[PDB]
Amino acid sequence: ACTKNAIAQTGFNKDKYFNGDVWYVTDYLDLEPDDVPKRYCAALAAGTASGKLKEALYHYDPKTQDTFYDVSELQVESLGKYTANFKKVDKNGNVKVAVTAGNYYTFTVMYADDSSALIHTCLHKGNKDLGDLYAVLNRNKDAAAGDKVKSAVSAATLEFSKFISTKENNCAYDNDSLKSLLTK
Ligand code: HEM
Ligand SMILES: [N]
């Protein structure tokens, strides 16, 4: 179960974050550790499409090759805090698993600048028991976490040394699919 009410960044700039571009997960912290594999690739695009706030997600397990995309129209709880009812899609936006009640994630932007971000997410999916997941994002898939985002990790009373990097998984991403999924 999730346990954190993450606080959104003071002064969060929504239009800059939701600009239609891609964010890569470089490091993550799962509070229920073997909730998720130790090795993993994830990325997202976030933007407004025809007036609607959207995210597109990509997950890839580099060992099993398990791959999935999702798209969601995000609902606002407060500035920097969203609820996302997701639908599983192929890379072209064709629906594989439709939106349903109880399949949603929350999404809190704790820190962001033009290049980096720290988010909290709580996933709800059917009758699964899932915990809090923090992710360090960068616009550059190979970027080491810098001082702004690492300080934000500290300010959240987290230890960056506990985060797991995604950099040794040889992750390769279809940025075009993520951008185009925002419209779907
Ligand atoms: C970037 C932020 C992230 C968001 C918003 C997010 C969101 C989601 C969503 C919505 C699903 C369900 C998709 C579906 O069933 O269609 C999912 C599944 C999953 N995510 Fe993430 N995720 C993120 C990052 C990660 C990372 C970094 C890992 C790390 C290992 C991860 C591991 C998983 C796993 C293992 C599942 C499968 C859950 C299951 O069905 O048992 N996610 N995630
Ligand atoms: N996740």
Curated annotation (Swiss-Prot):
Cofactor binding note of this UniProt entry: Binds 1 heme b (iron(II)-protoporphyrin IX) group per subunit.
Catalyzed reactions per annotation: 3 nitrite + 2 H(+) = 2 nitric oxide + nitrate + H2O
Root EC class: oxidoreductase
Compartments where located: Secreted
S-S pairs: 2-122, 41-171
Keywords: Disulfide bond, Heme, Iron, Metal-binding, Oxidoreductase, Secreted, Signal, Vasoactive, Vasodilator
Gene3D superfamilies: 2.40.128.20
UniProt-listed GO biological process terms: vasodilation
Tissue: Salivary gland (at protein level).
Annotated function: Heme-based protein that delivers nitric oxide gas (NO) to the victim while feeding, resulting in vasodilation and inhibition of platelet aggregation. Reversibly binds nitric oxide (NO). Also binds tightly to histamine, which is released by the host to induce wound healing. NO release is pH dependent and linked to loop dynamics.
Stated family: Belongs to the calycin superfamily. Nitrophorin family.
Protein name in the entry: Nitrophorin-4
Organism: Rhodnius prolixus (Triatomid bug)
Taxonomic path: Eukaryota, Metazoa, Ecdysozoa, Arthropoda, Hexapoda
